[PDB]
Amino acid sequence: LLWEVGKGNIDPVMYARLFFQYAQAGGALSVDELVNQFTEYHQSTACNPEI
């Protein structure tokens, strides 16, 4: 697909698909892991509110 991002709003799929593109890309694979990282990233978002 095309998937132009212009007004991101959930709908995973696409994203996931990108994810896969990455996942596939080997520039992601433990994509999952990344989500952890991300989780953490998020989490750190959680952690810096004050920032």
């Binding site: 989490q43 959680a46 952690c47 810096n48 509110p49 004050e50």
Partner: protein
């Protein structure tokens, strides 16, 4: 009827504190990692009297 000066309890009624509530000597009382909304808004509590 303990009269108390704002900007001290950690002395003013020294150990009558949140710090105390930790025990917490006279360190912390701070901000702000993470943060985390909960307002469990009910309690289980009682009523007057037991004599």
């Amino acid at each position: 009827g303990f009269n108390l000066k704002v900007k001290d309890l950690n002395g003013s009624a020294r150990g009558l504190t949140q710090a105390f509530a930790i025990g917490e000597l006279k360190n912390q009382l701070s901000v702000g990692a993470l943060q985390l909304p909960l307002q469990f808004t009910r309690t289980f509590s009682a009523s007057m009297t037991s004599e």
